Ligand binder design. Structure first.
Ligand SMILES: *[C@@H]1O[C@H](CO)[C@@H](O[C@@H]2O[C@H](CO)[C@@H](O[C@@H]3O[C@H](CO[C@@H]4O[C@H](CO)[C@@H](O)[C@H](O)[C@@H]4O)[C@@H](O)[C@H](O[C@H]4O[C@H](CO)[C@@H](O)[C@H](O)[C@@H]4O)[C@@H]3O)[C@H](O)[C@H]2NC(C)=O)[C@H](O)[C@H]1NC(C)=O
Ligand SMILES: OC[C@H]1O[C@@H](O)[C@H](O)[C@@H](O)[C@H]1O
Lengths: 251, 264
């Protein structure tokens, strides 16, 4: 099947271009959606016709290498990637994926799943110690293009794309990383919002459109690693800058 | 499927100048007025929000003495109170309103002891409230347009856009719970608009809970002036120290703002 695409070329890429990229990305997946408090809720699984379930992302490294990843429109998750004729899927890969993605490419099943913990263990390192930014991204593509260190490399892609699309806070960090070509490791807060996306999605939906307070509180980490709990939307937003919501409730 | 009904939760009410809403002298007796007071632990400062759209402290419902502009707020028995003077709504814009009358909770002044009342919704900053257990203001960096930051300069009466420097004290803002934005190390100064018309400049005035100082951080990335529905815009024309003004929403980048919390 032919799925829409969103590409980002590192070669001569500015912070603005990146911003535009994360923009087209959100539009593509936030299609056919009712939103809460201004934030769209990814279509339920039982609503997205296969023809519009996956969106293809095209990332090219400085030397021209292009790696394509298919993201599930229902959860904004990265489900598989292909490069130079070959394609790869995680162990949990559902027939739907293989059956409709990268047809015409030698497909491969991986020895692991796409969990932040699974990826972490398979990689042999924890997100906290991995560098993100222009170079890490470029060097991440090459690695995947040559089917090597796929795990640790996926962690760079994931945080620099799906996560960015999710949290505008991350979008910023990354944006700044390009603007002055440096590198950074995720801080306690960043990873904190990454692991609680679902909870946030829950809290926000429960209260319903406009209602400010949360019935429960979200646990987030401060820079010092000190526990922090947001109990109201504005707080959650102002801190994370969340952009997309994951369907959990129905209100 | 279908949002589960939440259980009654307890939180405090932070409003104007950071003061908390608490029942006078902690008297649980029917009729006791509602007022402002520094945020502490005192049980009477705690409010439980039930699904019946009613908020109550020490068991008594928060009731609107009257349903017209000027009527004061106080506590009383829910079973005998009026089924409308006990119903409240908490909106993200920071608006606590009474469905029936349409009047919103108000704080005439920021002086503790001030009795809260029901008033006509004019979106002033005196009608800006935030209910949460975290009673502190979020200190942050206000990044925008060209990766530059909102910087208060000189005699804290002007705000220009300059290259972001986290350590620059003049680039640190405190997102108060009363919906006003103030200078971190000068929380008496609020980011203020010179008017409610397009192109109206944006400077730094004394905090008085005016409609010109009430801001709402919309999830779309924009910051709006509830009263004028106008948003913060960065004058592109400027080479350096580009100024900010209020301009009708357009969607353009210079109307995008990201609150990067430096501390939380
Ligand atoms: C945003 O704006 C707010 C408002 O000003 C700032 O918050 C204040 O920050 C300052 C700066 O850190 C805080 O002062 C610190 O106070 C420490 C404690 O001093 C008191 O000691 C007496 C003892 O007699 C007690 O009675 C008091 O209760 C206090 O505890 C003071 O020690 C500290 O210095 C530090 O120096 C070194 C560390 O480098 C240590 O050796 C030392 O022990 C101490 O840690 C500071 O002077 C002040 O408390 C804050 N006030 C409020 C209301 O928050 C934010 O800092 C601003 N945001 C940013 C990002 O800057
Ligand atoms: O202004 C009257 C004050 O009376 C005290 O007894 C009470 O603890 C304060 O919170 C405040 O209500």
């Amino acid at each position: 099947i032919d799925y829409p695409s969103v590409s980002f070329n590192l070669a001569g890429a500015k912070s603005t271009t990146y911003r535009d990229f994360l923009k087209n990305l959100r539009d593509r997946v936030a299609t056919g959606t009712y939103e809460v408090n201004g934030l769209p809720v990814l279509r339920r699984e039982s609503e997205v016709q296969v023809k519009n379930r996956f969106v293809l992302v095209r990332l090219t490294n400085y030397n021209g290498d292009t790696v394509t990843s298919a993201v599930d429109v229902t959860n904004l998750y990265l489900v598989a990637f292909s490069a130079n004729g070959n394609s790869y899927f995680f162990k949990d890969a559902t027939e739907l994926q293989k059956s409709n993605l990268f047809l015409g490419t030698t497909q491969h099943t991986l020895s692991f799943t796409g969990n932040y913990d699974n990826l972490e263990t398979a990689a042999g390192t924890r997100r906290e110690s991995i560098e993100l930014g222009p170079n890490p991204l470029d060097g991440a593509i090459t690695s995947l293009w040559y089917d090597g260190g796929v795990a640790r490399s996926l962690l760079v892609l994931i945080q620099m794309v799906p996560e960015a699309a999710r949290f505008r806070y991350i979008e910023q960090e990354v944006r700044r990383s390009l603007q002055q070509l440096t590198s950074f490791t995720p801080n306690a807060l960043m990873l904190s919002m990454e692991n609680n996306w679902s909870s946030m999605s829950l809290e926000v939906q429960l209260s319903g459109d406009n209602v400010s307070p949360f019935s429960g509180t979200v646990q987030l980490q401060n820079y010092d690693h000190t526990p922090r709990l947001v109990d109201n939307f504005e707080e959650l937003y102002k801190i994370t800058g969340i952009a997309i919501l994951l369907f959990r409730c129905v209100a | 499927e279908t949002c589960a009904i939440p259980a009654p939760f307890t939180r405090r009410i932070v409003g104007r100048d950071g003061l908390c809403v608490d029942v006078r002298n902690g008297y649980d007796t029917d009729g006791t007025p509602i007022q402002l007071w520094p945020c502490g632990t005192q049980r009477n400062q705690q409010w439980t929000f039930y699904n019946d759209k009613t908020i109550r402290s020490m068991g008594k419902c928060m009731t609107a003495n009257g349903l017209n502009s000027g009527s004061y707020i106080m506590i009383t028995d829910c079973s005998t109170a009026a089924e409308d003077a006990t119903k409240w709504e908490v909106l993200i814009d920071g608006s606590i309103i009474n469905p029936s009358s349409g009047l919103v909770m108000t704080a005439p002044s920021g002086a503790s002891r001030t009795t809260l009342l029901l008033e006509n919704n004019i979106h002033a900053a005196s009608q800006g409230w935030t209910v949460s257990n975290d009673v502190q203001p979020i200190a942050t960096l206000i990044v925008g347009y060209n990766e530059m930051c909102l910087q208060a300069n000189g005699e804290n009466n002007n705000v220009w856009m300059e290259d972001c420097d986290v350590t620059s004290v003049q680039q640190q803002w405190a997102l108060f719970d009363d919906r006003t934005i103030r200078v971190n190390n000068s929380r008496g100064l609020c980011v203020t608009s010179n008017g409610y018309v397009s192109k109206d400049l944006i400077v730094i005035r004394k905090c008085q809970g005016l409609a010109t100082q009430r801001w709402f951080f919309n999830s779309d990335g924009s910051v709006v002036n509830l009263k004028s529905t106008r948003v913060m815009d960065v004058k592109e024309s400027d080479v350096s120290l580009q100024e900010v003004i209020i301009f009708p929403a357009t969607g353009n980048p210079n109307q995008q703002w990201r609150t990067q919390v430096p501390q939380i």
